[PDB]
Design a protein around this ligand. Structure first.
Ligand code: NAG
Lengths: 50, 50
């Protein structure tokens, strides 16, 4: 770290045997969904006789 | 039978480390440094050996 370097956008101190070339970003979100619902019903009889 | 399906994919190079809730602005204003070579052109190095 003799002639102690620093990255161009100075926010680090690289050692003087390395050089940097700055770039990036990347991300990706994704999601899914699934629902359901069911029902039913009834029946009836009746007879009143005589 | 409900089914959402969401995707998302940012791919930035290069500004401030991206994050979903970021405005389309604070990205820009934060580009002061964080510049990146988006395009480049040069010569074959044998040309420079003269
Ligand atoms: C997701 O499903 C909900 C119902 O739960 C629906 O209102 C909405 O439009 C769907 N899409 C998004 C992006 O929320």
């Amino acid at each position: 770290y003799t002639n102690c370097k620093t990255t161009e956008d100075g926010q680090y101190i690289i050692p003087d045997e390395v050089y940097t070339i700055p770039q990036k970003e990347s991300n990706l979100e994704m999601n899914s969904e699934v629902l359901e619902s069911w029902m039913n019903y009834q029946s009836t009889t009746s007879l009143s006789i005589n | 039978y409900l089914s959402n399906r969401t995707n998302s994919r940012v791919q930035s190079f290069g500004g401030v480390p991206f994050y979903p809730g970021i405005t389309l602005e604070t990205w820009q204003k934060g580009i002061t440094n964080h510049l990146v070579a988006i395009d480049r052109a040069g010569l074959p190095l044998h040309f420079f050996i003269k």
